[PDB]
Design a protein around this motif. Structure first.
Motif, PDB file in Angstrom:
ATOM      1  N   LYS A 151     -50.685  45.022 -17.542  1.00  0.00           N
ATOM      2  CA  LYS A 151     -49.973  44.471 -16.399  1.00  0.00           C
ATOM      3  C   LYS A 151     -50.623  43.187 -15.889  1.00  0.00           C
ATOM      4  O   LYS A 151     -50.504  42.861 -14.706  1.00  0.00           O
ATOM      5  CB  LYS A 151     -49.881  45.522 -15.294  1.00  0.00           C
ATOM      6  CG  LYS A 151     -49.031  46.719 -15.700  1.00  0.00           C
ATOM      7  CD  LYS A 151     -49.039  47.822 -14.668  1.00  0.00           C
ATOM      8  CE  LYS A 151     -50.123  48.839 -14.946  1.00  0.00           C
ATOM      9  NZ  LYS A 151     -49.803  50.162 -14.345  1.00  0.00           N
ATOM     10  N   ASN A 152     -51.336  42.473 -16.768  1.00  0.00           N
ATOM     11  CA  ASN A 152     -51.823  41.107 -16.540  1.00  0.00           C
ATOM     12  C   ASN A 152     -52.856  41.026 -15.412  1.00  0.00           C
ATOM     13  O   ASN A 152     -52.781  40.162 -14.541  1.00  0.00           O
ATOM     14  CB  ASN A 152     -50.658  40.149 -16.282  1.00  0.00           C
ATOM     15  CG  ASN A 152     -49.687  40.089 -17.438  1.00  0.00           C
ATOM     16  OD1 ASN A 152     -50.087  39.942 -18.590  1.00  0.00           O
ATOM     17  ND2 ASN A 152     -48.402  40.184 -17.135  1.00  0.00           N
TER      18      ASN A 152
ATOM     19  N   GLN B 284     -43.162  29.831  -8.305  1.00  0.00           N
ATOM     20  CA  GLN B 284     -43.178  29.809  -9.762  1.00  0.00           C
ATOM     21  C   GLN B 284     -43.843  28.568 -10.340  1.00  0.00           C
ATOM     22  O   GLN B 284     -44.176  28.567 -11.529  1.00  0.00           O
ATOM     23  CB  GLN B 284     -41.755  29.916 -10.302  1.00  0.00           C
ATOM     24  CG  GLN B 284     -40.925  30.977  -9.627  1.00  0.00           C
ATOM     25  CD  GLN B 284     -39.642  31.258 -10.358  1.00  0.00           C
ATOM     26  OE1 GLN B 284     -39.495  30.907 -11.523  1.00  0.00           O
ATOM     27  NE2 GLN B 284     -38.697  31.888  -9.676  1.00  0.00           N
TER      28      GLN B 284
ATOM     29  N   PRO C 291     -39.734  30.976  -4.942  1.00  0.00           N
ATOM     30  CA  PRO C 291     -40.690  32.079  -5.029  1.00  0.00           C
ATOM     31  C   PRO C 291     -40.559  32.800  -6.358  1.00  0.00           C
ATOM     32  O   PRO C 291     -39.502  32.801  -6.988  1.00  0.00           O
ATOM     33  CB  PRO C 291     -40.295  32.985  -3.860  1.00  0.00           C
ATOM     34  CG  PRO C 291     -39.573  32.104  -2.926  1.00  0.00           C
ATOM     35  CD  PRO C 291     -38.856  31.105  -3.770  1.00  0.00           C
TER      36      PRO C 291
ATOM     37  N   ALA D 270     -40.056  35.805  -8.907  1.00  0.00           N
ATOM     38  CA  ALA D 270     -39.012  36.816  -8.802  1.00  0.00           C
ATOM     39  C   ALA D 270     -39.555  38.154  -8.315  1.00  0.00           C
ATOM     40  O   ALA D 270     -38.832  38.916  -7.664  1.00  0.00           O
ATOM     41  CB  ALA D 270     -38.312  36.982 -10.149  1.00  0.00           C
ATOM     42  N   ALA D 271     -40.818  38.455  -8.609  1.00  0.00           N
ATOM     43  CA  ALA D 271     -41.418  39.734  -8.260  1.00  0.00           C
ATOM     44  C   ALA D 271     -42.342  39.652  -7.053  1.00  0.00           C
ATOM     45  O   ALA D 271     -42.998  40.642  -6.726  1.00  0.00           O
ATOM     46  CB  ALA D 271     -42.184  40.290  -9.459  1.00  0.00           C
TER      47      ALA D 271
ATOM     48  N   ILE E 261     -53.704  31.130 -16.729  1.00  0.00           N
ATOM     49  CA  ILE E 261     -52.846  30.134 -17.356  1.00  0.00           C
ATOM     50  C   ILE E 261     -53.317  28.743 -16.958  1.00  0.00           C
ATOM     51  O   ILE E 261     -53.671  27.927 -17.816  1.00  0.00           O
ATOM     52  CB  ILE E 261     -51.368  30.350 -16.983  1.00  0.00           C
ATOM     53  CG1 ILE E 261     -50.824  31.602 -17.673  1.00  0.00           C
ATOM     54  CG2 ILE E 261     -50.541  29.138 -17.363  1.00  0.00           C
ATOM     55  CD1 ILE E 261     -49.382  31.881 -17.374  1.00  0.00           C
TER      56      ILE E 261
ATOM     57  N   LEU F   1     -53.648  36.859 -15.846  1.00  0.00           N
ATOM     58  CA  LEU F   1     -53.117  36.345 -17.101  1.00  0.00           C
ATOM     59  C   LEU F   1     -51.749  35.695 -16.935  1.00  0.00           C
ATOM     60  O   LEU F   1     -51.300  34.992 -17.846  1.00  0.00           O
ATOM     61  CB  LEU F   1     -53.042  37.466 -18.138  1.00  0.00           C
ATOM     62  CG  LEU F   1     -54.295  38.327 -18.309  1.00  0.00           C
ATOM     63  CD1 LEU F   1     -54.053  39.437 -19.313  1.00  0.00           C
ATOM     64  CD2 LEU F   1     -55.479  37.481 -18.725  1.00  0.00           C
ATOM     65  N   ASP F   2     -51.080  35.908 -15.802  1.00  0.00           N
ATOM     66  CA  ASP F   2     -49.772  35.323 -15.545  1.00  0.00           C
ATOM     67  C   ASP F   2     -49.724  34.458 -14.294  1.00  0.00           C
ATOM     68  O   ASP F   2     -48.671  33.876 -14.010  1.00  0.00           O
ATOM     69  CB  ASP F   2     -48.710  36.424 -15.437  1.00  0.00           C
ATOM     70  CG  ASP F   2     -49.090  37.508 -14.450  1.00  0.00           C
ATOM     71  OD1 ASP F   2     -50.145  37.388 -13.799  1.00  0.00           O
ATOM     72  OD2 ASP F   2     -48.330  38.487 -14.320  1.00  0.00           O
TER      73      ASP F   2
ATOM     74  N   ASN G 108     -49.667  35.407 -11.222  1.00  0.00           N
ATOM     75  CA  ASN G 108     -48.673  36.026 -10.359  1.00  0.00           C
ATOM     76  C   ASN G 108     -49.368  36.766  -9.228  1.00  0.00           C
ATOM     77  O   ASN G 108     -50.300  37.537  -9.469  1.00  0.00           O
ATOM     78  CB  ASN G 108     -47.799  36.996 -11.152  1.00  0.00           C
ATOM     79  CG  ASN G 108     -46.354  36.974 -10.720  1.00  0.00           C
ATOM     80  OD1 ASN G 108     -46.044  37.044  -9.536  1.00  0.00           O
ATOM     81  ND2 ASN G 108     -45.457  36.909 -11.688  1.00  0.00           N
TER      82      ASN G 108
END
Ligand code: ACP
Ligand code: NA
Ligand code: NA
Lengths: 298, 214, 929, 139
Positions: free
Chosen positions: C306-307, C335, C547, C549-550, C688, C703-704, C706
């Motif tokens: 889950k990053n 984003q 924003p 999405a999650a 990233i 890793l994302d 987020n």
């Protein structure tokens, strides 16, 4: 809504496209799960009030699995139902018959697998993918044995209901289960439904792995498109989507573990799914003039 | 504080009930399994204070008493007045029974003649372990060697049983007095009645050490 | 002995590389093959089977070797003294040997399983190096760097190997690896010192480029480099160490007492010694630490799919005690995928749209103001199209650089087109890179125009920081003076366009006079001489950064879980507040003091701040705020936004949050964010877009990038405190079944229900039960609805856990073993009423006439085969019952006359498994039963 | 439940026009509303009692069937608070609504508890009337 029946060298796919106008802009292509149609899966989601700000700018094309539609004749005894991988080969001729050049896919369960395999085969025809309750892996051996055991002991309706909904919501939500029980048992042909369930059970494996930076520059195998993975907090498919969260590039892939949600997030939490879908679409350059939700509310 | 009182107090109720259910599926005259006791071992009575080693002084009533009242109490049901209500079974036979009421034979105490502690020839009774069933084989005979002088259906069914005793009289003559006599009794002339084992030194043979303090 | 004294031409001679394109891949592969990997640094390690020697030794595992050796010595003495020795001491030694061998095999497997995953975590984020090969900028794995490459190092970049700097635009490196100094030392392509360790043209391996840019030729890669030629408590671990110590003390007390009582009860010396060492090494919680490590490693593996890459296991348990998250807007909460919505060159909302045809809505290049603004945006950007995907649409393209720059470049390409040729016409003279401290970026170009003054100035940055240095405007191609009649309109445009959460960037240009700046005027980045003040404002630019999405769902989960989300951003207090409301950080209801000063009309100074549970703090107000003034903001407001805040103030913010006793998780992606990442309880880096410096300072890597992945990691780490107790309450259940046989022996005077060998056999089969209890775990439905755990008050082990584990789930396994013992003794003749006071004659070797309850008479060696049958049945029943209980518990909730076996010990479970459900003890202990 | 009958947008009109003597109590819900989930068991145990021949209980998903949300004037927008809605259909035509819509078109807030359904909808009297009248149909 214009309904088309397309001869597709593996059967005939029934598609219902709403908002006919198109262009150089992608349309929204939806694929359902086992036990459902496009009506039982996405008809209270695209009728949701918040969703109406996204459907004036996009065309929505609803795809039905061959025979799992409304008023479908029974397939001949022992008809060779197409595989999960032959179901994804029926989509390019759907796009060419409707003159589509590109799609944004929403798939639930089996539809997510079919749309992911289609986007793996033809990455140029897909811009984004909203994958709900996606299982990229085969059933296995213990699960295969349990399925062979529950096939004779349990009814197909209860099998599908346990596939879709979690244990707690199979008892708490009276009207959801009592709605989808009639949906499964009365709106789908029960011979073709078992045919689709059999073809989904032996679904093979989605050959996807997470690209490692540097060393893994050899060939790679993954979806080269903006992916939105959607799963509920209390769904039976959480582990499947988390397995699909890996084996996918984190640069363009998003995982949404929706809270206070169950098996079907597009019907019980459509307000929280419309907002995520809107931001997912706006991240790729669409509907930029749509105001931020929770901001226009105030 | 006392929360365990209610928990533990009623925890035994299930344990007692499971014990009760187990105890009602058993008989009261025969064990469910009996292979650990397949052959009867031997034993010497009276049981000494030490490892089967008898030690008494002839010039003392108390030294030999601890064995004398033991023998008298053990040999009380064998006396003449307490064996007159049993059938006299034939000698050398294999008396069995099948009736709803089981009765044992008669064993007269006059069989074990001569208890010799004061005289100088102590008498100790060599018994045999009781096994439910297990009919003896061949000619059962207890062979005791150092002058050594040798002379079942259940507690509920076979009530009145009087097992066959063997009395061993080890004489302490003036020429050999004060020695540590080690006798080696053993069942002889039998097949079912086992007599050879490595760890089980008592399955068939009993070895006691009688010693008189001059 | 380096090449810092060599010439630029000599570097080409020595290494055979062109110092504008580097050595191409054709020779790069050959040189990599000849010398091997760049970063070799090979460390020596254990030969593996040597670790097995440490597993089959040490700790409490040597007590069993002491016992086995004593048993073998006694066997040797007995065999030498008495003929036909008893083959029992040899069996005793062999059993206590095989027990340790099997336990060591279990421990080795359980540790190798954790080590495999922990080493798997180190390959998900490899070190990267940017080498100029084939005349193009690539990004190779750091191990492919070849002696003679052309490596470019930007700010916050780990230096891949020893470089001889050939170009440096203000580069400073952190040389704390070989010195102790942490002050950034400037690097230049010029010879400075004879010592290679003190010259400015050499950058070393493993150092960080903390500011600027540079370029160098690799000279030493693997071990010839200067770095390769020269060669802690946490609350959970402290709690489990203290508990193990006290339980070991209890174990030793019980073992000594049992040994003494055995000696009193006519035991053999060797038998009682082995009994004591079988009680001690069965009551100690060996394997609890291994089970804890297994739990931590497994849950670190779960939250990596889950990053959420943790750099150590101590951050796994800290993530789960989190009560504050200080997050950054761009990239993490939005984003960083930016699209243009409206334009502002005139005093109006100039809409823009995709779908190039029909110009997008209604507008085109009619306005000269729009033309000038488009030129400014094109020239000031550094992002360029990637030379590929030409057939793809303009918006669906690959552009390398800043997201806002990419959006602007796509916008100019869609509107005018050929931004590369437009930049070619205006050749860049000097460039000032964007900085988080400057908040602007300017460039000077050459004008191929007709009425040009021969010099062109291009500027972009914060709109309010640009208007403050602008004295002229451009409306419909005409310059007018600056007054309030336009300032109110500009602020209204920022309010309306910025109030939609759209990032606005101010662009301005001043025609540099020819009489003051001739053709060959001196243009230097340092000590700027151009007229930065008094510029001509040519309008702003409004684009969206939606924003993630999650992210709104994640903020909702944080809100329900009691976690405070603080947004630290450098954007305007208008855009920042709009985005905070759009993602849910500022929820409905709660209003800023400026909102409640406008809902009902009073001046903002007349409003009581206690009526507002939300605030937006300007970074320039936090710079003059004492510690006591920031405290009144962090505790009186439930929703705080820090706007126009530099990355260097996140340290103050996390320190103020931690002064409230919180567990702060902070987000960083730069060199300046390192002290905050090292001060926070959890430091989160971006996998990233993040520096090599921030990835070192952090305890966690996204890793994302987020914000939702942080909340997912918190949710996953929250499941540690409820799975650790299921292990501490399962290593303890089996102790009572092991010690109750001897207690009942002593008290009731019955034949022994369980022996020492079977005691040591019980804890073998029941040793992996807590280990397999964690691979088959479950997640609660309310894990994210609970308040954050207080690590200084919430205790893993408490009386309610120890008392339950012992006196409720060991006293009902003891009864299930006692049942098997009683029955195996009952089927053979001895009834439980008879079995009382029998141990005196049962254990007497010279009493071979023990009376059966059915009248039989047993020999000593016949009684002690039924006794050993009872011992073995006790052991097997308890072990199989614990395993079946594990399966039944994690399946149901979240044969010949064998009714006395495992059957009853599962039946006794059923009663208390059900009866306990009735108590519902609230302060709940029905989760276990 | 085999006592509550779930409707489509074709069948609802069929079974409201099938019999004019019958009183129909229909709930208009949506699977995304959290108030309809709270009222789900209350409706079930109300139909478990007042399920006479002359008084049946129905249901219809207006979140999916939007042609029912229009013909029966039930607003599916989440800012209208019209879900769940209880309508009485004496004689095939609406006889009572809960929550009630005022002149402005705004639904007056109503608590959907059990004790508020029998009282305001007169369920105890509808039960008695229907159970007294149904015996005449078998004579
Ligand atoms: N390439 C660039 N050139 C000039 N100004 C830039 C720029 N990129 C960003 N800016 C401006 O710099 C200011 C502050 O930027 P900074 O990097 O400090 O925070 P940020 O804008 O990236 C949001 P966050 O801090 O949440 O990541 C903003 O007003 C932004 O518009
Ligand atoms: Na132990
Ligand atoms: Na233990």
């Amino acid at each position: 809504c214009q309904e088309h029946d397309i001869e597709t060298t593996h059967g005939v796919v029934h598609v219902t496209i709403r908002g006919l106008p198109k262009g150089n802009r992608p349309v929204i292509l939806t694929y359902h799960d086992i036990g459902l149609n496009h009506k039982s899966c996405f008809n209270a989601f695209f009728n949701f009030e918040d969703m109406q700000e996204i459907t004036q700018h996009f065309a929505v094309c609803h795809v039905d699995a061959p025979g799992q539609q409304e008023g479908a004749p029974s397939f001949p005894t022992g008809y060779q139902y197409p595989t999960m991988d032959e179901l994804a080969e029926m989509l390019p001729p759907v796009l060419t018959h409707l003159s589509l050049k590109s799609i944004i896919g929403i798939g639930v369960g089996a539809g997510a697998y079919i749309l992911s395999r289609f986007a793996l085969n033809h990455p140029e025809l897909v811009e984004g993918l909203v994958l709900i309750n996606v299982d990229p892996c085969a059933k296995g051996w213990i699960d295969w044995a349990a399925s062979k055991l529950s096939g004779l002991t349990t009814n197909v309706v209860d099998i599908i209901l346990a596939h879709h909904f979690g244990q707690e919501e199979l008892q708490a939500n009276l009207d959801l289960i009592q709605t989808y029980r009639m949906h499964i048992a009365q709106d789908i042909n029960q011979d073709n439904l078992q045919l689709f369930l059999n073809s989904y059970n032996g679904r093979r494996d989605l050959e996807i792995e997470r690209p490692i930076l540097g060393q893994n520059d050899n060939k790679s195998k993954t979806l080269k498109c903006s992916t939105l993975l959607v799963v509920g907090d209390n769904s039976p498919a959480v582990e499947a989507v988390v397995e699909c969260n890996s084996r996918l590039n984190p640069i363009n892939t998003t995982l949404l573990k929706m809270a206070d949600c169950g098996g079907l997030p597009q019907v019980v939490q459509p307000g929280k799914l419309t907002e995520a879908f809107k931001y997912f679409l706006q991240g790729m350059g669409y509907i930029p003039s749509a105001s931020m939700t929770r901001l226009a509310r105030s | 504080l006392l929360f365990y009182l209610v928990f533990y107090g009623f925890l035994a109720a299930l344990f007692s009930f499971t014990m009760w259910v187990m105890l009602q599926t058993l008989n009261d005259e025969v064990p469910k399994y009996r292979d650990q006791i397949p052959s009867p071992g031997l034993m010497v009575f009276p049981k000494p204070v030490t490892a089967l080693e008898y030690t008494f002084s002839r010039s003392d009533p108390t030294s030999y008493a601890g064995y004398i009242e033991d023998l008298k109490k053990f040999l009380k049901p064998y006396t003449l007045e307490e064996q007159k209500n049993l059938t006299v079974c034939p000698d050398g036979a294999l008396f069995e029974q099948k009736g709803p009421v089981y009765v044992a034979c008669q064993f007269p105490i006059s069989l074990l003649q001569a208890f010799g502690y004061s005289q100088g020839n102590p008498c100790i009774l060599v018994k045999m372990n009781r096994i439910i069933g297990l009919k003896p084989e061949g000619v059962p005979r207890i062979d005791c060697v150092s002058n050594v002088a040798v002379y079942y259906y259940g507690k509920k069914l076979h009530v009145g049983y009087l097992q066959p005793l063997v009395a061993v009289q080890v004489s302490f003559a003036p020429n050999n007095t004060g020695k540590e006599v080690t006798v080696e009794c053993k069942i002889d002339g039998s097949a079912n009645l086992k007599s050879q084992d490595d760890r089980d030194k008592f399955l068939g043979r009993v070895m006691f050490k009688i010693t008189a303090r001059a | 002995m380096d090449d810092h004294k060599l010439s630029l031409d000599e570097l080409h001679r020595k290494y055979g590389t062109d110092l504008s394109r580097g050595l191409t891949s054709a020779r790069a592969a050959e040189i990599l093959a000849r010398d091997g990997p760049n970063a070799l640094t090979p460390p020596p390690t254990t030969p593996e089977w040597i670790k097995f020697c440490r597993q089959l030794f040490g700790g409490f595992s040597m007590l069993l070797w002491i016992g086995a050796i004593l048993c073998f010595l006694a066997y040797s003495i007995q065999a030498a003294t008495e003929e036909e020795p008893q083959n029992d001491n040899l069996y005793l030694g062999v059993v206590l040997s095989a027990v340790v061998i099997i336990t060591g095999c279990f421990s080795y497997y359980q540790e190798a399983k954790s080590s495999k995953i922990m080493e798997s975590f180190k390959n998900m984020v490899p070190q990267q190096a940017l080498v100029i090969r084939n005349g193009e900028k690539m990004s190779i794995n750091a191990e492919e760097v070849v002696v003679g490459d052309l490596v470019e190092v930007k700010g916050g970049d780990r230096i891949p190997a020893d470089l001889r700097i050939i170009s440096a635009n203000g580069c400073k490196v952190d040389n704390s690896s070989l010195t102790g100094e942490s002050e950034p030392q400037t690097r230049s392509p010029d010879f400075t010192n004879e010592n290679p360790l003190e010259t400015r043209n050499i950058a070393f391996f493993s150092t960080n480029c903390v500011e600027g840019t540079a370029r160098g030729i690799v000279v030493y890669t693997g071990d010839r480099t200067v770095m390769g030629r020269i060669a802690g408590q946490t609350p959970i671990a402290a709690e489990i160490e203290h508990f193990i110590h006290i339980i070991t003390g209890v174990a030793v007390f019980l073992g000594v007492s049992f040994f003494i009582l055995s000696l009193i009860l006519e035991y053999t010396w060797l038998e009682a010694v082995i009994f004591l060492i079988g009680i001690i090494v069965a009551n100690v919680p060996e394997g609890l630490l291994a089970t804890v490590t297994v739990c931590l490693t497994l849950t670190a593996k779960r939250m990596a799919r889950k990053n959420c890459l943790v750099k150590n296991l101590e951050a796994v348990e800290t993530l789960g005690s989190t009560s504050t998250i200080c997050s950054d807007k761009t990239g993490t909460l939005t984003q960083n995928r930016m699209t243009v919505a409206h334009m502002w060159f005139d005093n109006q909302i100039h809409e823009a749209d995709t779908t190039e045809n029909q110009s997008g809505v209604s507008f085109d290049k009619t306005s000269a103001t729009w033309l000038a603004l488009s030129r400014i945006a094109g020239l000031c950007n550094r992002a360029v199209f990637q030379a590929n995907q030409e057939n793809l649409p303009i918006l669906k393209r690959a552009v390398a650089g800043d997201a806002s720059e990419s959006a602007l470049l796509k916008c100019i390409e869609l509107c005018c087109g050929s931004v590369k040729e437009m930049r070619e016409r205006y050749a860049k003279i000097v460039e000032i890179p964007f900085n988080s401290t400057n908040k602007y970026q300017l460039s000077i170009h050459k004008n191929p125009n007709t009425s040009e003054p021969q010099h062109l100035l291009v500027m972009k940055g914060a709109p309010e920081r640009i208007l403050d240095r602008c004295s002229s405007i451009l409306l419909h191609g005409k310059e007018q003076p600056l007054d309030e009649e336009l300032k109110d309109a500009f602020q209204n445009a920022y309010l309306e366009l910025g109030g939609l959460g759209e990032r606005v960037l101010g662009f301005c240009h001043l025609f540099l006079p020819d009489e003051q700046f001739p053709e060959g005027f001196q243009f230097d980045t340092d000590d700027v001489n151009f007229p930065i003040d008094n510029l001509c404002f040519v309008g702003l630019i409004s684009m969206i950064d939606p924003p993630r999405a999650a992210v709104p769902d994640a903020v909702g989960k944080c809100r329900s879980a009691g976690i405070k989300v603080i947004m630290v951003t450098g954007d305007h207090p208008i855009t920042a507040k709009a985005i905070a409301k759009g993602v849910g950080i500022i929820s409905e209801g709660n209003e800023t003091v400026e909102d409640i000063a406008a809902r009902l009309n009073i001046p903002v100074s007349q409003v009581n701040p206690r009526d507002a549970k939300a605030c937006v703090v300007h970074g320039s107000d936090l710079k003059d705020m004492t510690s006591e003034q920031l405290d009144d903001i962090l505790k009186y407001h439930t929703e705080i936004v820090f706007a126009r805040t530099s990355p260097q103030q996140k340290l103050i913010i996390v320190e103020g949050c931690q002064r409230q006793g919180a567990i702060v998780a902070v987000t960083g992606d730069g060199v300046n964010d390192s002290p905050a990442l090292k001060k926070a309880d959890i430091g989160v880096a971006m996998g990233i877009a993040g520096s090599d410096v921030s990835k070192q300072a952090a305890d966690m890597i996204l890793l994302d990038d987020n914000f939702a992945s942080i909340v997912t990691g918190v949710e996953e780490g929250r499941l540690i405190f409820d799975n650790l107790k299921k292990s501490i309450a399962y290593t303890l259940t089996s102790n009572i079944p092991e010690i109750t046989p001897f207690l009942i022996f002593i008290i009731a005077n019955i034949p022994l229900p369980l022996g020492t060998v079977t005691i040591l056999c019980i804890d073998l089969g029941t040793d992996m039960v807590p280990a397999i209890s964690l691979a088959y775990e479950q997640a609660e439905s309310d894990i994210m609805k609970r308040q954050p755990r207080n690590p200084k008050t919430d205790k893993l082990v408490n009386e309610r856990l120890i008392s339950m584990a012992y006196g409720q789930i060991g006293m009902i396994q003891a009864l299930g073993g006692f049942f098997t013992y009683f029955v195996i003794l009952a089927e053979n003749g001895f009834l439980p009423i008879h079995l009382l006071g029998l141990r005196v004659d049962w254990d007497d070797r010279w009493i071979n006439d023990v009376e059966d309850s059915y009248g039989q008479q047993w020999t000593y060696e016949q009684r002690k085969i039924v006794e050993f049958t009872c011992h073995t049945a006790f052991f097997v029943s308890i072990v199989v019952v614990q395993w079946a209980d594990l399966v039944i518990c994690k399946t149901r909730r979240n044969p010949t006359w064998w009714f006395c076996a495992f059957p009853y010990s599962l039946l006794i479970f059923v009663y208390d498994k059900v009866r306990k459900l009735i108590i519902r003890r609230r302060p709940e202990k029905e989760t276990y039963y | 439940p085999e006592y509550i009958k779930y409707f489509n947008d074709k069948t609802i009109d069929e079974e409201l026009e099938r019999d004019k003597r019958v009183t129909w109590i229909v709930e208009f819900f949506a699977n995304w509303s959290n108030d309809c989930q709270s009222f789900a068991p209350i409706y079930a145990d109300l139909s478990l009692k007042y399920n006479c021949t002359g008084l049946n209980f129905g249901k219809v998903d207006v979140g999916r069937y939007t042609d029912v949300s229009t013909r029966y004037k039930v607003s599916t927008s989440p800012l209208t608070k019209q879900l769940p809605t209880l309508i009485l259909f004496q004689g095939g035509k609406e006889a009572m609504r809960r929550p009630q819509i005022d002149k402005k078109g705004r639904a007056v807030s109503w608590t959907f508890s059990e004790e508020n359904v029998i009282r305001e909808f007169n369920l105890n009297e509808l039960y008695q009337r229907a159970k007294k009248l149904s015996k005449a149909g078998d004579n």
